[PDB]
Design an enzyme around this catalytic site. Sequence first.
Site, PDB file in Angstrom:
ATOM      1  N   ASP A 129      -4.842  -4.586  -2.753  1.00 56.05           N
ATOM      2  CA  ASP A 129      -5.339  -5.229  -1.536  1.00 56.05           C
ATOM      3  C   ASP A 129      -6.848  -5.022  -1.390  1.00 56.05           C
ATOM      4  O   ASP A 129      -7.341  -4.582  -0.350  1.00 56.05           O
ATOM      5  CB  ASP A 129      -4.581  -4.730  -0.304  1.00 56.05           C
ATOM      6  CG  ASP A 129      -4.929  -5.496   0.960  1.00 56.05           C
ATOM      7  OD1 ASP A 129      -5.426  -6.638   0.878  1.00 56.05           O
ATOM      8  OD2 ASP A 129      -4.698  -4.946   2.058  1.00 56.05           O
ATOM      9  N   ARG A 133     -12.680  -5.191   4.172  1.00 60.69           N
ATOM     10  CA  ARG A 133     -12.099  -4.353   5.219  1.00 60.69           C
ATOM     11  C   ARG A 133     -11.565  -3.031   4.674  1.00 60.69           C
ATOM     12  O   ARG A 133     -11.388  -2.089   5.457  1.00 60.69           O
ATOM     13  CB  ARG A 133     -10.978  -5.120   5.936  1.00 60.69           C
ATOM     14  CG  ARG A 133      -9.907  -5.652   4.999  1.00 60.69           C
ATOM     15  CD  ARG A 133      -8.903  -6.542   5.722  1.00 60.69           C
ATOM     16  NE  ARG A 133      -8.232  -7.429   4.778  1.00 60.69           N
ATOM     17  CZ  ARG A 133      -7.296  -7.036   3.920  1.00 60.69           C
ATOM     18  NH1 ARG A 133      -6.903  -5.772   3.900  1.00 60.69           N
ATOM     19  NH2 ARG A 133      -6.746  -7.910   3.088  1.00 60.69           N
ATOM     20  N   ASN A 134     -11.343  -2.951   3.358  1.00 60.59           N
ATOM     21  CA  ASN A 134     -10.756  -1.816   2.634  1.00 60.59           C
ATOM     22  C   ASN A 134     -11.771  -1.083   1.767  1.00 60.59           C
ATOM     23  O   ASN A 134     -11.383  -0.343   0.850  1.00 60.59           O
ATOM     24  CB  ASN A 134      -9.559  -2.263   1.770  1.00 60.59           C
ATOM     25  CG  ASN A 134      -8.372  -2.630   2.606  1.00 60.59           C
ATOM     26  OD1 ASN A 134      -8.241  -2.160   3.738  1.00 60.59           O
ATOM     27  ND2 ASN A 134      -7.500  -3.467   2.073  1.00 60.59           N
ATOM     28  N   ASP A 147      -8.191   3.002   0.418  1.00 58.34           N
ATOM     29  CA  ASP A 147      -6.819   2.508   0.616  1.00 58.34           C
ATOM     30  C   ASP A 147      -6.184   1.978  -0.668  1.00 58.34           C
ATOM     31  O   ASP A 147      -5.273   1.137  -0.628  1.00 58.34           O
ATOM     32  CB  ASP A 147      -6.724   1.476   1.744  1.00 58.34           C
ATOM     33  CG  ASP A 147      -6.769   2.102   3.118  1.00 58.34           C
ATOM     34  OD1 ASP A 147      -6.844   3.346   3.218  1.00 58.34           O
ATOM     35  OD2 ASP A 147      -6.694   1.344   4.104  1.00 58.34           O
TER      36      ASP A 147
END
Length: 267
Positions: A129, A133-134, A147
């Site tokens: 993913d 944002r990660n 993450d």
Amino acid sequence: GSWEIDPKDLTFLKELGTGQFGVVKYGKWRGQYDVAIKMIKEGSMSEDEFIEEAKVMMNLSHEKLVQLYGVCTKQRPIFIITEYMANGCLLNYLREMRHRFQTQQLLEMCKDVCEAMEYLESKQFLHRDLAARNCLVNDQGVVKVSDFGLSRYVLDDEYTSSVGSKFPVRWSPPEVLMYSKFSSKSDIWAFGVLMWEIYSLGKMPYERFTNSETAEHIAQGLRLYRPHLASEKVYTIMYSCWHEKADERPTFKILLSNILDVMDEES
Ligand SMILES: *CCC(=O)N1CCC([C@@H]2CCNc3c(C(N)=O)c(-c4ccc(Oc5ccccc5)cc4)nn32)CC1
């Protein structure tokens, strides 16, 4: 085992925000060492599987990868204890226009992430993913990948397949959207989208489309287009991540070499 931190060694100092697992805090370990503490709310995670995987994650080590220091699992919520990234998620950092970024800074962010991803690829570890944002930003402005692999342990099915309403459609290649075929080459596709996010200062990919319309756009063979801040050479790199055929997409090693070539040519 060595993966277990005693939560009594933590001093909580600041609230850092909330995400799909609950709260994140900043604190100290044994009075001296900065750490972040991600607290996993009950019912959100496949906890035994995550705890087993955390042992693998503790063995990963790279300067551009957020370091997992350990977990606290004797109570609930369980804690994930990591390196502290004071400037927060890359997405929100990009969206703060005050930074007035130079394109050399944006390319360096891409290189930071690419180095981490080349390392993960060398360990056969998929992110699954990757997105702005990660990624996280430290107090020196260095971007690190975070993450990694965590989506495998999410119990809320809205996140876990394209049938769900919270799946990362906008970061997914056609073979993921159509067949759920994850591979190194789906991380490559996502990395290209991340480069686009960086050069777009945090705009949402396919900003005018819904997820369903995005999937149709991809089914028609269409793509994101060049951000204003990306040179032709930068655009070529991100676009190479989006070949329809997964096997025609580069590796992270090749992407890193291409990014370094461009950094030299644009310095
Ligand atoms: C834009 C996304 C967003 O709004 N948020 C995600 C980041 C959240 C905060 C921001 C401040 N710092 C921080 C940290 C940190 N380490 O400093 C974390 C964080 C992230 C991930 C983990 O645990 C894992 C790391 C690596 C692999 C697996 C798990 C711990 C802590 N989160 N933030 C604010 C909200």
